[PDB]
Amino acid sequence: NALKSDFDSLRDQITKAASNAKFNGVSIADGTTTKLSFLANSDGSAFTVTAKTL
Amino acid sequence: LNSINTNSGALIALQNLNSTNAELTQVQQRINTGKKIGSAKDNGAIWATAKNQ
């Protein structure tokens, strides 16, 4: 039961540590979106970065 | 052309000098403040995002 409580504490620290990693209201690793694109050219070409859920 | 009154070339030189002075002004605030976006006057979007974050 002690190792069970330790495992549950570690798994919900993973939950909060993954959920709280935002920047400017946006996160590539919380799973809220499939990808994010950033400017790469003057004509509006984007630089794709596929999201990797954690 | 050729007149004691109007002299447009000095006006154009004053315009270029005022532009160089305004550029010196922005460079001085960027050097002393240390931020590329030191105020909402510089760029409101990045400035508001930076203050919120």
From Swiss-Prot, chain A:
Q: Where in the cell is it found?
A: Secreted; Bacterial flagellum
Could you tell me the superkingdom of the organism this chain comes from? Bacteria
Subunit structure of this entry?
Answer: In C.crescentus, the flagellar filament is composed of multiple flagellins of 29 kDa; 27 kDa and 25 kDa.
Entry function: Flagellin is the subunit protein which polymerizes to form the filaments of bacterial flagella.
Family label: Belongs to the bacterial flagellin family.
UniProt-recorded name of the protein: Flagellin FljM
Portion of the parent chain present: 111 to 164 of 273
